[PDB]
Amino acid sequence: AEITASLVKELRERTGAGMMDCKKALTEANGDIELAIENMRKSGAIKAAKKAGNVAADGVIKTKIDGNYGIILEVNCQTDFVAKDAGFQAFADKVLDAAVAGKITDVEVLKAQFEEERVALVAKIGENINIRRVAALEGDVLGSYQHGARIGVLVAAKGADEELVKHIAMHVAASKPEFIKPEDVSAEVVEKEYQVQLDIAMQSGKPKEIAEKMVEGRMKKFTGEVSLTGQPFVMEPSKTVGQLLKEHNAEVTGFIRFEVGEGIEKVETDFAAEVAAMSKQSHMSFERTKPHVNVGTIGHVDHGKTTLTAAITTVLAKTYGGNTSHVEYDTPTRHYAHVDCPGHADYVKNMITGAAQMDGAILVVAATDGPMPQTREHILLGRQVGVPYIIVFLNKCDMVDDEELLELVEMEVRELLSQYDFPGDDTPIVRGSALKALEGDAEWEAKILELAGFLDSYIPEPERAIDKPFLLPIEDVFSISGRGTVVTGRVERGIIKVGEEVEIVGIKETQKSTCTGVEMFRKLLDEGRAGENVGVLLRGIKREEIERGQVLAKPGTIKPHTKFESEVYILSKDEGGRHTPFFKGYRPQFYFRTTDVTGTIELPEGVEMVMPGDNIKMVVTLIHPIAMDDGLRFAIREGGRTVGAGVVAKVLSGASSRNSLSAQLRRAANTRIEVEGNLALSIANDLLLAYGQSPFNSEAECISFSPRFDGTPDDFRINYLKAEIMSKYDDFSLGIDTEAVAWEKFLAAEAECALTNARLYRPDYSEDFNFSLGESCIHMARRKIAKLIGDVPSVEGMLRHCRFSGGATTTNNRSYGHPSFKFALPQACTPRALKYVLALRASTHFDIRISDISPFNKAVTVPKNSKTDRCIAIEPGWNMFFQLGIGGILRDRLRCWGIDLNDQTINQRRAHEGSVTNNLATVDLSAASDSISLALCELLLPPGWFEVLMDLRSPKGRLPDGSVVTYEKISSMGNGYTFELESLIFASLARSVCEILDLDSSEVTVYGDDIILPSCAVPALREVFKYVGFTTNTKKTFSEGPFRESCGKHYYSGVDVTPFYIRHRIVSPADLILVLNNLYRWATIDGVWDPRAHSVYLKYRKLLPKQLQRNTIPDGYGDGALVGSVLINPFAKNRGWIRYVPVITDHTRDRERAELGSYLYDLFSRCLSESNAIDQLICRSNPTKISRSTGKFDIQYIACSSR
RNA sequence: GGGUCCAUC
RNA sequence: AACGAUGGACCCA
Ligand SMILES: Nc1nc2c(ncn2[C@@H]2O[C@H](COP(=O)(O)OP(=O)(O)OP(=O)(O)O)C[C@H]2O)c(=O)[nH]1
Ligand SMILES: [Ca+2]
Ligand SMILES: [Ca+2]
């Protein structure tokens, strides 16, 4: 020991101060029980003195109302855990009561009346408690709402009853309005705001009263939103609170809402790197299949878990070997991931969301203090989250020179433990110190070894997935002539062997059957094992007897249920979730392994509203059974959006939309807007007029107008719209205009490759004299290409990227384009392509067959603009299959040149930058890919690659003429690698051009033929391009001036100047809606109209059937309704707290799919996968359904918010 | 992913 | 009867 202190428990059994603040203030009181008590009193304020050195951004809010007088209280602390703590409740419940009767309002007044009790309950807790700010409200008939400790509100009404103020209090808590009336806002806070914004807009170049009226209508909205009056009522958002009051002859005298920790900052805590630095000072001085075990540290702010995780890392490293911010360490036998539990709600969230499943907690308590009040709450979190085991580390024992005392604290913890139904008598308790273990001290050092030994020993090994009873969530069901019925999915757990009997359980009466077989794409199989994608064949059962959503389990293993208790987390706005609260009758979709299912919920007693971000518990009853174990995770969904995650707790026992409306809308949708003349042109012209420009004299001027590249941005913007707007209209009368043009272009590119092909195979200028930029970039580019690409397309590469995709082939018309049809119907293939097919056919047991063997593709024509079509070519099915393989690998390799062909947004932003700085150029080639000759590829690519390109292309073309071409270009548009090959060729040359000029290659950025490099490089790029057989399009290439374009964004001195196109004769209401919405999005700034354009919009909105004039959707939801305000939409039905708007959809009819083909396509897909708050992964990917568009329109109801 | 629709290369 | 690619919305689930 050190001193004579064996019954200090009496000194602590009334102070809860500590075994080293009791054993200590007792050696300076010579042993006087009632004497020490006082030495600690007046000394307990000096600990609370350095206490205020800890940011305390958690706590509670409280509210009290004297039938007519109300008060709202805010009392802070450091963590969730103390805020739920019984003692912290009593202090602030008193400071609340004793602020109601003694009506206080002066904050620092109620503070000092509660300072000596504040140090009595701050020495006992160990956290900076501090009554932050109080306030109070008085009114005629006032009311309050509170959810949990986090948000409290006081509302003052007049002419309102009990419910009304309750509801308005709830709304105030959900929508936090800064003001009661729009008219309240500082009549000069907005004055400066309208004066700053008025210029911002005047800058675009828009005339006084344009920026004026926009800024006005803007700010009219800005205010209504931050104001009770002009906020859509939370319990029926179709009307505002403003309107809600007026129907009850009521008014709000005012309101107050505090939120715990508002305005604090609370510096973020990164635990994972926390230990890195903690270990920093100390950093100086097959068996890849170990079980992974999840542990977490939990305890008082800094009893030392702070440092103990460090100590575990060092000491475990020093001795043995070496997601979401987690330390991890190793044991001779196991692997551990370790998380800190800094907060109760923070943790419960991660446990539901599945971001932190704990196999065992380690509860850290420093013996210097012993257990604390809030340690009750730490063990309680463990109880509530169901952590199976808790191990205890007694920390800071170096500062306890009396072992008799350790046994005292160890005994307390053993008792709190048992109070919460944990095995307190039998739980491992290590007595040690991390303080002196990370700093090398063999004594306290092996104590960490002792604890680790208990992670290995006491926390049992987590059951391996392969060890659990078999289960496969069913994704799809297939009838296969001769084979029988087969289900596909990923085996979730266990093994299934052929012959074994299986149960199929879920949506309908559970059935049984027997596993005939197991197969993948390549092999056929004896068993399917956990984590494997397979199809499983069944005996007897029919395809119509099975359903996606069911599972396939070892019989009896799992049962179907409909009702259950869960822990769910509702996502916040900032997490892509709901942005509005729900209430009693929430009715969403519950997504289980692989399917959505409907269900109603019941909230617990005393909760009436859930807001985004909430950790609600709820009882969910489903519309029909589905197989569920205990601890099954699900997603909460609203029409495809995930708005919540949940896990099932205890499985229980079990026990409006508009049809004429939809009909009215459908008849409306299938009507034809009927007008005299060219309606598109009338619209374009009325718009030109409303902006003060001359209209289009004739159909001919629509396609032959040139913009001026000067003027204010405002004037260029409309001027450029005029130039572009009608430029792709497919329905002009006057024009000897045909696809004859496309074919001439197409013939012209070929002739051009003929020349370049001749010229480029003759790199001999009759002598070793003359040097050229062209020859030089090719040599330079070649060498770079070879380093990026290899000598040849890897095997892995091909097997990772070949696949079928999409539309027509030489053998299939568009209506048979689905991949499953490419596997069913036999595909054509090229003589040189044949060996690829054979190698494919050698890799599976499935039938891979060839309709024909032939060197032709089909040159056809597609729409492009008012002056010309585009000739493309339809490939042979199997050549495609292989063309996408190389296309996919070039796509990967290009990432190393910082070229990212999945993201056109890089080119858009660099085009924007370019128009501001003039340092970047946007370049365009005249017939990009048709001009890429065989000769150019041959001396740019490794031989290996060139050969494979030559196998895979189609060498000849059959034109609609009946006539032929033998391809001079390397490949036509339609070929599955043309786009990635042109991207490569273009980048390589441009990059080489950068070098030859001492520019940085990384300034080169390419998407197809959309090229961006530094402006300086352009004249040289132009020359290299000329040399290799390209023609740069001067008209669409910009190395100077205010203007840039890349990937469909157009900028002028930095302003978005992108236009919209009217492409077709407008004839259906959906046509007109498209046009009106495109006008909307072009002339609207954040919902606010440019008035010049609004006048045109309103005039043509009148041509729609009336109901369609008012059927509005928000932006971001397609074009089956007009974009506008969904809160005004008379057709919007709210069902179970979710909004549904009806939209026009193309009316379809179901078709029959090819069963063997669809099966094949499924398996082939799963083969592809294998070889290549964060819970988007609770979902799958879907079956194959075929359909045909009739030409009619349907009306579909869809969920939408305002996100 | 596949379709439909919207931008695009 | 219209090819290949990207991103978005709905729908497929
Ligand atoms: N298969 C296919 N490829 C396309 C299509 N549009 C563009 N591309 C690819 O993007 C590049 C060309 O874009 P565009 O600029 O519109 O066509 P272009 O052939 O170069 O002719 P131009 O500049 O004169 O209009 C090359 C081409 O492979 C298309 O509709 N289908
Ligand atoms: Ca081009
Ligand atoms: Ca371009």
mmCIF file of all heavy atoms in Angstrom, chain A residues 923-925 1009-1011 1036 1045-1047, chain B residues 9, ligand 3:
data_model
loop_
_atom_site.group_PDB
_atom_site.id
_atom_site.type_symbol
_atom_site.label_atom_id
_atom_site.label_comp_id
_atom_site.label_asym_id
_atom_site.label_seq_id
_atom_site.Cartn_x
_atom_site.Cartn_y
_atom_site.Cartn_z
ATOM 1 N N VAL A 923 -11.066 22.530 -77.897
ATOM 2 C CA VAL A 923 -10.829 22.171 -79.293
ATOM 3 C C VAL A 923 -11.809 21.116 -79.799
ATOM 4 O O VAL A 923 -12.227 20.234 -79.043
ATOM 5 C CB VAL A 923 -9.393 21.642 -79.527
ATOM 6 C CG1 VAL A 923 -9.209 21.320 -81.001
ATOM 7 C CG2 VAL A 923 -8.358 22.655 -79.076
ATOM 8 N N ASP A 924 -12.172 21.213 -81.077
ATOM 9 C CA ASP A 924 -13.128 20.273 -81.699
ATOM 10 C C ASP A 924 -12.680 19.813 -83.084
ATOM 11 O O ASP A 924 -12.369 20.636 -83.938
ATOM 12 C CB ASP A 924 -14.524 20.912 -81.806
ATOM 13 C CG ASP A 924 -15.510 20.042 -82.574
ATOM 14 O OD1 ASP A 924 -15.568 20.128 -83.831
ATOM 15 O OD2 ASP A 924 -16.236 19.266 -81.918
ATOM 16 N N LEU A 925 -12.672 18.509 -83.319
ATOM 17 C CA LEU A 925 -12.299 17.982 -84.647
ATOM 18 C C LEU A 925 -13.523 17.784 -85.535
ATOM 19 O O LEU A 925 -14.589 17.449 -85.054
ATOM 20 C CB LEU A 925 -11.497 16.691 -84.519
ATOM 21 C CG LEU A 925 -10.165 16.877 -83.769
ATOM 22 C CD1 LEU A 925 -9.575 15.552 -83.230
ATOM 23 C CD2 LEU A 925 -9.201 17.609 -84.696
ATOM 24 N N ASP A 1009 -13.918 13.626 -78.529
ATOM 25 C CA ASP A 1009 -13.171 14.590 -79.307
ATOM 26 C C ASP A 1009 -13.219 15.990 -78.695
ATOM 27 O O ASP A 1009 -12.758 16.965 -79.261
ATOM 28 C CB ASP A 1009 -13.583 14.545 -80.761
ATOM 29 C CG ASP A 1009 -14.624 15.559 -81.112
ATOM 30 O OD1 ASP A 1009 -15.614 15.748 -80.360
ATOM 31 O OD2 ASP A 1009 -14.427 16.163 -82.187
ATOM 32 N N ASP A 1010 -13.768 16.048 -77.499
ATOM 33 C CA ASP A 1010 -13.824 17.248 -76.698
ATOM 34 C C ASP A 1010 -12.460 17.371 -76.000
ATOM 35 O O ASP A 1010 -12.165 16.664 -75.016
ATOM 36 C CB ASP A 1010 -14.937 17.052 -75.678
ATOM 37 C CG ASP A 1010 -15.807 18.268 -75.491
ATOM 38 O OD1 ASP A 1010 -16.700 18.552 -76.336
ATOM 39 O OD2 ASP A 1010 -15.613 18.908 -74.442
ATOM 40 N N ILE A 1011 -11.617 18.239 -76.555
ATOM 41 C CA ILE A 1011 -10.237 18.345 -76.138
ATOM 42 C C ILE A 1011 -10.012 19.670 -75.423
ATOM 43 O O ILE A 1011 -10.475 20.720 -75.862
ATOM 44 C CB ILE A 1011 -9.275 18.162 -77.324
ATOM 45 C CG1 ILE A 1011 -9.564 16.830 -78.024
ATOM 46 C CG2 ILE A 1011 -7.801 18.221 -76.878
ATOM 47 C CD1 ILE A 1011 -8.730 16.621 -79.269
ATOM 48 N N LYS A 1036 -15.749 25.553 -83.966
ATOM 49 C CA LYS A 1036 -16.096 25.105 -82.630
ATOM 50 C C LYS A 1036 -14.829 25.018 -81.784
ATOM 51 O O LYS A 1036 -14.824 24.401 -80.700
ATOM 52 C CB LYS A 1036 -16.802 23.740 -82.669
ATOM 53 C CG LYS A 1036 -18.019 23.634 -83.594
ATOM 54 C CD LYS A 1036 -19.263 23.111 -82.836
ATOM 55 C CE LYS A 1036 -19.026 21.726 -82.183
ATOM 56 N NZ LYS A 1036 -20.024 21.338 -81.110
ATOM 57 N N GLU A 1045 -16.693 26.096 -74.825
ATOM 58 C CA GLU A 1045 -17.670 24.989 -74.751
ATOM 59 C C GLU A 1045 -16.988 23.629 -74.589
ATOM 60 O O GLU A 1045 -16.081 23.288 -75.329
ATOM 61 C CB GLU A 1045 -18.605 24.955 -75.984
ATOM 62 C CG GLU A 1045 -18.244 23.928 -77.127
ATOM 63 C CD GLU A 1045 -18.605 22.425 -76.832
ATOM 64 O OE1 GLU A 1045 -19.450 22.153 -75.932
ATOM 65 O OE2 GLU A 1045 -18.034 21.503 -77.511
ATOM 66 N N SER A 1046 -17.416 22.839 -73.623
ATOM 67 C CA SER A 1046 -16.964 21.448 -73.566
ATOM 68 C C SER A 1046 -18.129 20.627 -73.045
ATOM 69 O O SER A 1046 -18.828 21.072 -72.123
ATOM 70 C CB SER A 1046 -15.763 21.287 -72.637
ATOM 71 O OG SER A 1046 -15.031 20.080 -72.857
ATOM 72 N N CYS A 1047 -18.358 19.450 -73.640
ATOM 73 C CA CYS A 1047 -19.366 18.517 -73.123
ATOM 74 C C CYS A 1047 -20.717 19.144 -72.824
ATOM 75 O O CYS A 1047 -21.307 18.849 -71.794
ATOM 76 C CB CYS A 1047 -18.865 17.848 -71.841
ATOM 77 S SG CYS A 1047 -17.415 16.841 -72.134
ATOM 78 P P C B 9 -21.652 17.509 -77.107
ATOM 79 O OP1 C B 9 -21.016 18.802 -77.455
ATOM 80 O OP2 C B 9 -22.667 17.003 -78.061
ATOM 81 O "O5'" C B 9 -20.562 16.373 -76.835
ATOM 82 C "C5'" C B 9 -19.233 16.605 -76.359
ATOM 83 C "C4'" C B 9 -18.448 15.342 -76.615
ATOM 84 O "O4'" C B 9 -19.082 14.231 -75.928
ATOM 85 C "C3'" C B 9 -18.493 14.944 -78.078
ATOM 86 C "C2'" C B 9 -18.340 13.423 -78.031
ATOM 87 O "O2'" C B 9 -16.968 13.038 -77.954
ATOM 88 C "C1'" C B 9 -19.094 13.057 -76.739
ATOM 89 N N1 C B 9 -20.456 12.511 -77.063
ATOM 90 C C2 C B 9 -20.640 11.112 -77.226
ATOM 91 O O2 C B 9 -19.668 10.351 -77.058
ATOM 92 N N3 C B 9 -21.868 10.609 -77.550
ATOM 93 C C4 C B 9 -22.908 11.433 -77.727
ATOM 94 N N4 C B 9 -24.103 10.911 -78.043
ATOM 95 C C5 C B 9 -22.756 12.851 -77.575
ATOM 96 C C6 C B 9 -21.543 13.338 -77.247
HETATM 97 CA CA CA D 3 -16.580 19.618 -78.912
#
